[PDB]
Amino acid sequence: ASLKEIIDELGKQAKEQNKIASRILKIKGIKRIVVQLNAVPKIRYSMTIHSQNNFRKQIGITPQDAEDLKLIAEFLEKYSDFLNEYVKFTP
């Protein structure tokens, strides 16, 4: 499933149901931080990060998360132009 497929799927779901629809992006190489894409409804997107170990609670980062954070930064830069033509983000 590509990013665009996920974006499209979350958009359609958030509309049919009138509530946030979410999906974990499976960014290659990430060890612990999980990036979740959210479609918030007239549909705007955001991305939140989560620990696999306390998935529902706010993430506490430690120094061992440095490489994850870099991979997330790289993924953002790699898809930046596309995302900025394709979706609107949360305020």
- Could you list the residues that contact a copy of itself (CB under 8 A)? 35, 38, 46-49, 53, 58-63, 65-67, 69-70, 72-74, 76-77, 79-80, 83-84, 89-91
Q: For residue 4, which phi and psi values (nearest 5 degrees)?
A: -60, -45
Single out the residue of 6, 23, 27, 71 in contact with Cl ion (rule: CB under 5 A): 27
| Degrees, nearest 5: CA angle 56-58-63 | 120
Q: Centre a 10 Å sphere on the Cβ of residue 20 and count the other Cβ atoms it contains.
A: 13
Longest dimension (CA), the chain: 41
CB 3, CB 25: distance < 8 Å: yes
Give the nearer residue to a copy of itself in terms of CB position, either 28 or 91: 91
Give the nearer residue to a copy of itself in terms of CB position, either 13 or 46: 46
**Considering the complex, what minimum distance in angstroms separates the CB of residue 19 from Cl ion?**
19
Contact residues: Cl ion, CB under 5 A: 25, 27, 34-35, 51, 54, 59-60, 79, 81-82
